[PDB]
Structure formats: structure tokens, C-alpha cells
Amino acid sequence: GLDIAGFMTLVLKESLNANETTQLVQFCHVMAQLSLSVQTLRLSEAELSVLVISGFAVLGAKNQPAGQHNIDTLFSLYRFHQWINGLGNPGSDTLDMLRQQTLTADRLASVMGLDISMVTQAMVSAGVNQLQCWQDINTVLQWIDVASALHTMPSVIRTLVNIRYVTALNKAESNLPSWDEWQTLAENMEAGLST
Amino acid sequence: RREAAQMQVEYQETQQAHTQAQLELLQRKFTNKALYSWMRGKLSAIYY
Amino acid sequence: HNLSIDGQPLSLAIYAEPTDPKALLTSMVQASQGGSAVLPGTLSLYRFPVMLERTRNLVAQLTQFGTSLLSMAEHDDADELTTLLLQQGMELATQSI
Amino acid sequence: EADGNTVSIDPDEEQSTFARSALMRGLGVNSGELYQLGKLAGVLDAQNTITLSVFVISSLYRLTLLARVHQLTVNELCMLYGLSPFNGKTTASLSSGELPRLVIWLYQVTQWLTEAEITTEAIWLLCTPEFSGNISPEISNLLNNLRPSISEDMAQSHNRELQAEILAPFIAATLHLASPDMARYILLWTDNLRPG
Amino acid sequence: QFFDLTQSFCLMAQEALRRELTDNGVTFIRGGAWNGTTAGLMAGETLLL
């Protein structure tokens, strides 16, 4: 329950409050834990500065703004660091276009070196219309990760997942494909197979 | 003996991996190449 | 199953060894930040040459401070590197054991 | 496949034809690079369609052949063609000598880059007349440093070599360069270019 | 802290010069010596210039 200015004012206080020193030592220890986190995760100056200045708006979290101190923040931050390292050199100024809301799909695919159409399909299947936050970017990453994992298109993995196998209720509804739709799904899915 | 050869292979993996990590830690160390580039530039201009 | 009389298969498969992973490379990642702002200038009481010489010696002191700081930084950094190397040596020695 | 009807190779095409799937597997290429290959071939049609003629399959298989022989991917071939002198021409509109001329050009280039140990995106960036897409932090620090450091007083002068000299320090630094004379020389070069 | 002190002294010197030459336009300390990207290093050389 503190700010930095008050931190300083009561620090110049010679500990004139008995129970406040407990939360001050806790406050120092939580800076210690945050520093331990950034050190072990090996995050560097520029991306951490981007995340802090943006207030983690360019990360996004579940039911909690900016970033809390739980496993979800740690996991997401590690993923973002791994991705930002795998970006290469130009990826750094990608962070630049991440700082503002210029993060666009075609430039994203170009810097990725992958096909644009894959990203279009991931955008339409993940439901994301714009990369407001790293929530969207990470979800598109996972969608394309699945698509490349099976060596196939994002549309058909969308469709396979789209088959709610509940067969006339006990869930949303029966997304069972028709006979010809089943055949076409199979045809496309097996297309990327060797001899 | 085969199992022996396998774990010396994973040993060589350990060597390579922490060599690469050492490289990264040197890259991210405080006195990097960006520092020296800035320092070169400002010194050269003021010197001239 | 078109085997031998004792179950030996007549056809041999392939291993299909993967492409193997890739080593990640780190790039110089920089965030541009500005320098400190100009403060307004108030007026002194000494004349120009005296202030010239006093600020001269102060700035010399500051510059030697800067260079001493840098040498400290270098020694610190190499010291860290050598400690890291020793750690790696320890774990490698355990594996060789 | 020797039936000649129209089929769409649109990767975004819902309900892809069985013939599209057959082309997919026969070519050993995914849909995205297949569509890239259609673009490069210029045998495209509206909504990313194509007739199932023998000649189109022939040309696609030929380009795939060129990709696989020189140990390079479809996109890498596309980019090297874009920098190749035969850029701006569809492979379908190639003269009888234009083919062997092209193949020897690309063999010698691939051998050159093999012995010179330079990748494909490195060369694509190294040669392209295309820019990044926005303003970079490096040029931002350039603005934060060049603007205070120098002024217009000598910026209206006619002696270009002196201006190149005085600009050389920052360019060498921010560009991670060996010596200021390298910066001055490369500035002279780029004035020989006049890019923008 | 030392750099703050010398920045104060340099601006005092500049104003004294401005009064001596009775021309209030000449400026040399135009900021940026404390380059935050480099922990505000090496500003003494800029002040020397």
C-alpha cells in the first residue's frame, strides 16, 4: 500500500511506525524478487523498458491489468522474451511498432519470414482482428505453431477443432461434418503426406 | 557401452548449450557494443 | 505376415532422422531515450576567467571519475565471466565423473 | 489432372478441389508456397484460379525443380528472381534461350553464395530497394545526437567531401563501423547513388 | 550529483559570459550531456567542449 515518494519519506523517517517496517522490508523483498525474475529470465534493457512504459498493456493478462505477481505473468513474460530473442535484428524495431499500435499482419509475416496467407488464416480462426496486445500475438503464435506442427493450413485445424463432437447436445451443438464435407476435410488434411 | 556413448553425446550437448548461453550473457553484459559505439561516436565528434 | 519361419521380417524400415534444432542468436536490442533537459541559467558574481579555471578543474575531476568508473566496470564484468566459466567447469566435471 | 477445368489454388478457398490436393502432394509444397509459386509463374487467374492444362503443371513442376536442385526454398527462389535481371518477367513468358541462360545464372549465383557463406534473407536485405516500414529507434537516436551536434551553418555549403567528413563519426558509430574514413567513403558512395 | 553541480556551474558561466558580451543569444550548453542510455556517462567531455 505504498508509493515511491512515501517510500522515501518514511525511509528518511527513522522507522517511526512499528508495523510499517514490516511492509517496508516486504516492499524491499518484492523488489528483490522482481529483480531475481528479470535476471533469471535474462530480460534486457529495451524490451523491459517498452513493457514498463507501456505498463504491460502490450502484454495483456487474464482478469488483471498490466501484470500481477503470479505464474501467468511469469509464463507470458518468458514466452515474450523467447520470441523477442528469436525475432533477430529487425525484430528490435518490431518492438518499436509494438510500442504504438502499428503492429500489422503483413509486416508481421514479412519479419517472420513465413507466408502472409497463413497469418490471414490464423487471424480469422483465432478471431483476432488486430494485435492490440501480446494476448493476440501469442494466440496467433500458438495457432500457427499448431498449423506448422501438423504441416498443414490453419483453416483446417480450425475446422477440426470446430467439430464439437457432442453429436446433438450435451454441449453446444453437433458440428458433425456432412459426408462430402468429411471427405474434403480428410483430402486436404492428408495432402501434406510423403510417399 | 552404448549407453555410455549416448550420455557422452548428451555431455557434448551440455557443452554446446552452456557455451551458447555464455555467448548470450556476454552479449547482454552491461559494457556491450552499443556502449562502445556511442562512446566512439561522441568522442570522435568532440575530438574533431 | 510374410515373415520367415521364425518371425523374422523380410522388410527393413528407415529411421528418418530429423533436421535438428537451431541455435538462437541475440541481437543488439536498444530503446532510444533522451538526455537531460536544459535548466535555466542564473547569474554569478565572479568574472569570466576565474569561473573558467574553477569549472576547468571540476570538469577534469569529473572526467577522471568517469574513466575510473569505466575501469571498475570492466574488471567487474570479466570477474563475473570467470565465475560463470568456473560454474560450467564444475558441472562438466560432474558429467565426466 | 489432364482434364483442363478451372481450379482455384487460393489457399483461403473453402472447399478446395481434390485436384488442388493432388497438385499439393505431387509438388511436395504447401498451399501458401504453391500460391507464391503461382504468383511467380504469372499463370494466375482471378480469385487465384488456374486451368488444369498440361503446360501449367509442367511449368510449376519446373520451378519446383529449380528450387529443389539448388537447395533453396520457394520464397528464396522468388526473392533471387526478384533481384535477378530476369525479374519482371513471368517464367511462362520465357524464351527458349532464356531458360538455360537463367539456370546458369542461378547456378553460378547459388555457388557464389555457397562459397561466400551468405544466407538468402541476408542477400535479400543486402540488395532490395525496399525499406523497413517505419521509423527506427536507431534513427531516433541519430536525430537526438546529430541535431544538437551540427547545424545549418555548414549545411548550405558546396564542399560535399567536408560535410561527409563531419557526418562520418556518427554514421560510423551508429552503424557499428571500423573507422570514420569508412563512414566518409560509404557516404561518398551513397551520394554516388542518391537513393531517395 | 557531481554532474548536477557542474552543470549548474557551467550554466552560471554561460550567463556570466552573456552579460560580459552583452549578447543574450549565444548558447553552448544545449543539453543532452546526461545521456540516460549510458547511465549519463562521459558528460565531462561535452562540458569541456
From TrEMBL, chain B:
The protein's name: XptA2 protein
Organism the protein comes from: Xenorhabdus nematophila
Parent sequence residues shown: 2247 to 2294 of 2538
